[PDB]
């Protein structure tokens, strides 16, 4: 993908301002509520039976933070996202057996959380850059499914 300077700057700005141990948990918790089928892989997390329980779940929070932290490698080198996530893609496919469409759903929830975090500053132009970036990450994560 040909990244513009605005896109590169916007992505760095957003991620540098996000508090991972807040945004991460919020994102995964939102995804587990809005797209309940994503709960399929978290049976060991315990009670995910309702929005309140999900929000109070420490394991959900921990994993959400892990996911957000997992995006840093993409932010650092936006021109090599495919190769950078190759191993992680294989892991999700062959070890975790995660349906890759869930990545798109998680990305949508992240966009919603980021929008709430930045309010008026999350313009259409910023949204375009953020979604473009997330789309590349999502594509890369599902690339090694065979």
């Amino acid at each position: 993908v040909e990244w513009t300077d605005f896109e590169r700057a916007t992505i760095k700005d957003i991620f540098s301002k996000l508090e991972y141990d807040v945004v991460g948990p919020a994102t995964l918790a939102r995804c587990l509520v809005v797209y309940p089928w994503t709960q399929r892989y978290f049976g060991k997390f315990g009670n995910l039976y309702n929005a309140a329980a999900i929000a109070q779940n420490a394991m959900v929070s921990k994993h959400g933070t892990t996911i957000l932290n997992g995006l840093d490698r993409a932010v650092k080198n936006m021109d090599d996202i495919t190769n950078t996530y190759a191993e992680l893609s294989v892991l999700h496919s062959e070890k975790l057996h995660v349906d890759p469409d869930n990545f798109k759903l998680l990305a949508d929830c992240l966009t919603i959380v980021v929008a709430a975090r930045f309010g008026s500053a999350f313009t259409g132009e910023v949204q375009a850059a953020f979604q473009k970036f997330m789309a590349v990450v999502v594509s890369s994560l599902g690339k090694q499914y065979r």
Partner: protein, 142 residues
């Protein structure tokens, strides 16, 4: 389908955000044409297609007016949105793919404007509601 829980959630959310419908519509459509430039083909008849323009603001009022109607007719969206469906089906011929796009933009706008009100519970219900609206608008399509 929308449960009683979904209906109460949407009515309650709309009760809180309804006052800002004009702004929501303007913001939603402005995002749509910027983030998804392909949607602009439906407005090729306008003098121009630019964010926050008089045309976009007016269209914002139209769409949010449709949403307001949907909230009132939430118990039966198909019947409630009949006229809108006929319009979009025979005159406009708007590909349903765009309803999904606009719905996503509407959710984004609401999150930016009402972060505290747009909880995950409000989100799941509104999402189900908007999908129902998109399907009701597609009723007369084929």
């Amino acid at each position: 389908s929308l449960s009683d829980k979904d209906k109460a959630a949407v009515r309650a959310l709309w009760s809180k955000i309804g006052k800002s419908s004009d702004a929501i519509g303007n913001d939603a459509l402005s995002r749509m044409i910027v983030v998804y430039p392909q949607t602009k083909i439906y407005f090729s008849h306008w003098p121009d297609v630019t964010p926050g323009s008089p045309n976009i603001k007016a269209h914002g009022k139209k769409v949010m007016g449709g949403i307001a109607l949907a909230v009132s007719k939430i118990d039966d969206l198909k019947t409630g949105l009949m006229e809108l469906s006929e319009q979009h089906a025979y005159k406009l011929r708007v590909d349903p793919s765009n309803f999904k796009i606009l719905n996503h933009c509407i959710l984004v706008v609401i999150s930016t404007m009402f972060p505290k009100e747009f909880t995950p519970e409000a989100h799941v219900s509104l999402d189900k509601f908007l999908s129902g609206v998109a399907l009701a608008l597609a009723e007369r399509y084929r």
